[PDB]
N, CA, C and O atoms as a GROMACS GRO file, in nm:
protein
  180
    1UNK      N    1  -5.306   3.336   2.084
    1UNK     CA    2  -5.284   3.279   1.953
    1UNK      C    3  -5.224   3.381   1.856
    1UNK      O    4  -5.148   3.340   1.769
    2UNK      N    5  -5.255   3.520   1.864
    2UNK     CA    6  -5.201   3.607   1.781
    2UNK      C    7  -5.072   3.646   1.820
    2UNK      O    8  -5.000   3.707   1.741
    3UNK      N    9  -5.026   3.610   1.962
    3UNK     CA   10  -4.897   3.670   1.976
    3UNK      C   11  -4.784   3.517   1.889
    3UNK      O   12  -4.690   3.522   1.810
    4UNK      N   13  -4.837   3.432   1.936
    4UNK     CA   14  -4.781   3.311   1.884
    4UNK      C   15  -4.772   3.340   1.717
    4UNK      O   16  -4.661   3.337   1.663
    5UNK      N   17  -4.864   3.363   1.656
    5UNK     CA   18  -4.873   3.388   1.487
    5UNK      C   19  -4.787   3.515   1.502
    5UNK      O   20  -4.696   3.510   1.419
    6UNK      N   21  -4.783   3.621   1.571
    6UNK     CA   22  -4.702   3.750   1.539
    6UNK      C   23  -4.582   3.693   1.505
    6UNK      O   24  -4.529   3.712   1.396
    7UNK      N   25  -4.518   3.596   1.625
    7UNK     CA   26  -4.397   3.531   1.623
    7UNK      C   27  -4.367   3.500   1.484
    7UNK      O   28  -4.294   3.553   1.401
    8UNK      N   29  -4.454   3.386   1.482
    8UNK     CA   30  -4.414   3.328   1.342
    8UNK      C   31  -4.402   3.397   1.156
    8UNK      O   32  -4.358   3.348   1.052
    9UNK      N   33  -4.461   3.519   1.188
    9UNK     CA   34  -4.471   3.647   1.100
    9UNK      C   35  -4.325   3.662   1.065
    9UNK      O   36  -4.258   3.655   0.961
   10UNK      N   37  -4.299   3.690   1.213
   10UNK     CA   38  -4.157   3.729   1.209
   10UNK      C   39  -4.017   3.586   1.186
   10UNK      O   40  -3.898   3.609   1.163
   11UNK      N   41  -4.066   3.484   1.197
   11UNK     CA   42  -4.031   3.374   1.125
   11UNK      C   43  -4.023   3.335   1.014
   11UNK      O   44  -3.949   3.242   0.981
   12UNK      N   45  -4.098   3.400   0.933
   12UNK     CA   46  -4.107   3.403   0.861
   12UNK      C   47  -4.064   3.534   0.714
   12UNK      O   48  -4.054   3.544   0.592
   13UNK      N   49  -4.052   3.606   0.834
   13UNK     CA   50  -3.913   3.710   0.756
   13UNK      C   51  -3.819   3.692   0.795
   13UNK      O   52  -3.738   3.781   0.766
   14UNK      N   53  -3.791   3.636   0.838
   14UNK     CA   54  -3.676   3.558   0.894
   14UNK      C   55  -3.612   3.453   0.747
   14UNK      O   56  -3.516   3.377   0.763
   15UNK      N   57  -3.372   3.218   0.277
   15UNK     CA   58  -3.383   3.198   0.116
   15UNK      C   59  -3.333   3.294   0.047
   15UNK      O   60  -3.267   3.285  -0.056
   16UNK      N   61  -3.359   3.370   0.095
   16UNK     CA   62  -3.270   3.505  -0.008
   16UNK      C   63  -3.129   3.493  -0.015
   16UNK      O   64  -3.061   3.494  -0.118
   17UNK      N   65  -3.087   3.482   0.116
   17UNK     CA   66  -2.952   3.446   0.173
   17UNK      C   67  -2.904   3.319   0.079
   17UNK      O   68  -2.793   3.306   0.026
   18UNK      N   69  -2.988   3.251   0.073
   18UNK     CA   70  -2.891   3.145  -0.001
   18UNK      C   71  -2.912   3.178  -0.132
   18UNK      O   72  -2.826   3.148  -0.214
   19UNK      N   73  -2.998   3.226  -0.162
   19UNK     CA   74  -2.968   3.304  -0.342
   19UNK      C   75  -2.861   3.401  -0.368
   19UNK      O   76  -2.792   3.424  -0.467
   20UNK      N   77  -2.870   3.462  -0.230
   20UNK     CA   78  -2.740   3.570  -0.249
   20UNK      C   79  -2.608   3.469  -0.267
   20UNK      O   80  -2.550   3.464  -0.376
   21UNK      N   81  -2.568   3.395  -0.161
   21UNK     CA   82  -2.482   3.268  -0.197
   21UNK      C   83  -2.445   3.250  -0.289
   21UNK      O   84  -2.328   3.219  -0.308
   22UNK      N   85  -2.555   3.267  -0.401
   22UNK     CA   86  -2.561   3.156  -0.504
   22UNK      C   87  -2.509   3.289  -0.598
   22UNK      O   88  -2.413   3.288  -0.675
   23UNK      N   89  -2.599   3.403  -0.570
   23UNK     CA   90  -2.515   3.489  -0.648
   23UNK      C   91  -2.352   3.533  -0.636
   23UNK      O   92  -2.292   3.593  -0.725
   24UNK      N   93  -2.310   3.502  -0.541
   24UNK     CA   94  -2.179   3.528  -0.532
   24UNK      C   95  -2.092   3.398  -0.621
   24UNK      O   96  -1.981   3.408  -0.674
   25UNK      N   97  -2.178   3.284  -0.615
   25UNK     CA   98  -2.078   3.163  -0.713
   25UNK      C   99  -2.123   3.233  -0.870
   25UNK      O  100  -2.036   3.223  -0.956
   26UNK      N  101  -2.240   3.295  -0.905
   26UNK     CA  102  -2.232   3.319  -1.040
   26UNK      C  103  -2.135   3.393  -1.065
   26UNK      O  104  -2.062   3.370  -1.161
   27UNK      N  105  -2.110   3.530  -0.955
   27UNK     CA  106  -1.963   3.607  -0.992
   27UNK      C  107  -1.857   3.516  -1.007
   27UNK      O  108  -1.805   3.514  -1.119
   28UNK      N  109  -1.819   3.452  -0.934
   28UNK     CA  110  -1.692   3.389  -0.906
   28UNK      C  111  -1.667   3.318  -1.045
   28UNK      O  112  -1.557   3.316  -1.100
   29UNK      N  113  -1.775   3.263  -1.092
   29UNK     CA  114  -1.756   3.165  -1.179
   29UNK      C  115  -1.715   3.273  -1.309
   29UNK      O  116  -1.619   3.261  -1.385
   30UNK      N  117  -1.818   3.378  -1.310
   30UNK     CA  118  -1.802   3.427  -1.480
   30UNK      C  119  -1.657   3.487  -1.454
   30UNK      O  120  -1.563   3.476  -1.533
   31UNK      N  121  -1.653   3.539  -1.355
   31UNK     CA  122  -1.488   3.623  -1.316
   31UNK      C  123  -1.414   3.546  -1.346
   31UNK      O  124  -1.335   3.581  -1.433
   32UNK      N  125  -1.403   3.421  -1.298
   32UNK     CA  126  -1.268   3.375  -1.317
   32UNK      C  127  -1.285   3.270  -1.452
   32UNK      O  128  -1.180   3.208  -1.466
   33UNK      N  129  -1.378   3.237  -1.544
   33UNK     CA  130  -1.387   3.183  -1.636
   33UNK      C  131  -1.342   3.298  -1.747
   33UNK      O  132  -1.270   3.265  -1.841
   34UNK      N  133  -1.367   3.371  -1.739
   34UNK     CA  134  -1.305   3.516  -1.796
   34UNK      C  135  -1.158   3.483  -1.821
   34UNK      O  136  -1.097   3.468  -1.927
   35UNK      N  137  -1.107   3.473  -1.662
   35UNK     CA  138  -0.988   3.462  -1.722
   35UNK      C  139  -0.935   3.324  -1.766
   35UNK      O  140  -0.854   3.316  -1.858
   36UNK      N  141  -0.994   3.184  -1.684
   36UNK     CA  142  -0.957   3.064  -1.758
   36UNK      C  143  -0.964   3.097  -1.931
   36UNK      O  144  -0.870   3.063  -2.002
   37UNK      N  145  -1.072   3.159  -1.983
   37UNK     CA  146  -1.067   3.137  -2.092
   37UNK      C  147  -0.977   3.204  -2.190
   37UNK      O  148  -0.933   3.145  -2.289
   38UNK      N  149  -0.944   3.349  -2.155
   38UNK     CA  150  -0.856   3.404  -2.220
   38UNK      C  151  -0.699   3.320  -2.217
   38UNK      O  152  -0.623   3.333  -2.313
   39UNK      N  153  -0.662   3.242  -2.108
   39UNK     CA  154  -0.533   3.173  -2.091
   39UNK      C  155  -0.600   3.083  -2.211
   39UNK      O  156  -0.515   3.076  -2.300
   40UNK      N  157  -0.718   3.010  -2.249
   40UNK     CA  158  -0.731   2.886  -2.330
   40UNK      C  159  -0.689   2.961  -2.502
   40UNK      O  160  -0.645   2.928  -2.612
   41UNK      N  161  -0.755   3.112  -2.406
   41UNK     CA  162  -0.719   3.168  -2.568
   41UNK      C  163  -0.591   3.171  -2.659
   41UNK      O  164  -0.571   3.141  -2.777
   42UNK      N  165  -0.516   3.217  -2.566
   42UNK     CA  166  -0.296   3.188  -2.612
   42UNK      C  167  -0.302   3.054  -2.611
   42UNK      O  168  -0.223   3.018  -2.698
   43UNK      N  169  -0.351   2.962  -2.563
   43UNK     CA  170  -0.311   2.842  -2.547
   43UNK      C  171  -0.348   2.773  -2.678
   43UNK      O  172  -0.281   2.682  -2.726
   44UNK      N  173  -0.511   2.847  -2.760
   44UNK     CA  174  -0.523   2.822  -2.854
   44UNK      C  175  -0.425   2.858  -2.968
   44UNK      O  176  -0.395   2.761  -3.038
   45UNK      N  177  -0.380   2.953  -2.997
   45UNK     CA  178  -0.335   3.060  -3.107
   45UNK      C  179  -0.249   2.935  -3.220
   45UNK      O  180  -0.195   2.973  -3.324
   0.00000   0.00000   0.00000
């Protein structure tokens, strides 16, 4: 039973990953809203 639970220990370090994911769309987004917005900026003037 404990080797079976060891397993699952390790199953259990086995979500981050998809936060990391998620952190890579927050870059993407502020990066390139950065620049959408500066184009809105001339576009404003």
């Amino acid at each position: 039973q404990q080797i079976d639970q060891q397993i699952e220990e390790e199953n259990i370090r086995q979500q981050r990953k998809a936060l990391q994911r998620e952190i890579e769309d927050d870059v993407s987004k502020q990066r390139e809203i950065k620049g959408q917005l500066l184009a809105e900026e001339f576009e404003r003037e």
